[PDB]
Amino acid sequence: HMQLNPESADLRALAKHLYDSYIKSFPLTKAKARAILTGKTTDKSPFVIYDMNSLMMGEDKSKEVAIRIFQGCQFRSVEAVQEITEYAKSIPGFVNLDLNDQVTLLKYGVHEIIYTMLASLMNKDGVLISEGQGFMTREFLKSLRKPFGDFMEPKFEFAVKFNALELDDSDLAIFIAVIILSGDRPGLLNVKPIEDIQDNLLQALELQLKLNHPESSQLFAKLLQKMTDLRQIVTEHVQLLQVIKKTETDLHPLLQEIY
């Protein structure tokens, strides 16, 4: 029997703390993304990039289109890493970890969290871009010449399955915190402090999913199983990043100034 006791109440307070920080860190939420995608918002209707002519017009509303699109992907990922890091600072205990362990956690976690949260902005048709100002079709991205054509497609394949779980921002805030505090990342100095925070976040996540999803009794287990899909996504992603570095040309301004 689940009881609303001091321990559970504290787990609900930890869930709310993360939700609030999530809202502050992440400009476009799943609630707002889904409103846009289903046409249930009063906000400005996104511009749809579905062919080469709608890309050209969209770049208003590199000589090579595929490269320009990859360039925008790259700059967006720098921005996303900054937002995830701000979020990570809000997770109780995280900034109190050794700074090298904080860095290691984010360096191995950010890609998993990027594709988790990009699914909130995705459907079978495409993905919201420019904080919901544009919509780029999955088939238009698939049409880009090798090796760019197959770059986003595995993230769509993940996302239509992931979205079927019908997680909401309250669920995702805790899920992402669980990803960040993974004690199994290579090169971690002090593992037990990370495991202890992860254990508290796993308790909070399990309780979140029991209260919020009465019709999937094992959603908690299903979500933990999604971490293998994410690891594979990131393994395959990193392989494609290399092939693009070996075989193409293109830095974000922040990166240029850091040197």
């Binding site: 890493v81 890091t85 860095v103 360096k107 950010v110 974000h252 922040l254 990166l255 850091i258």
Partner: peptide, 12 residues
């Protein structure tokens, strides 16, 4: 290397 730079800056 590039990823780590951005993370370290953002934590400060």
């Amino acid at each position: 290397m590039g990823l780590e730079a951005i993370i370290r800056k953002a934590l400060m």
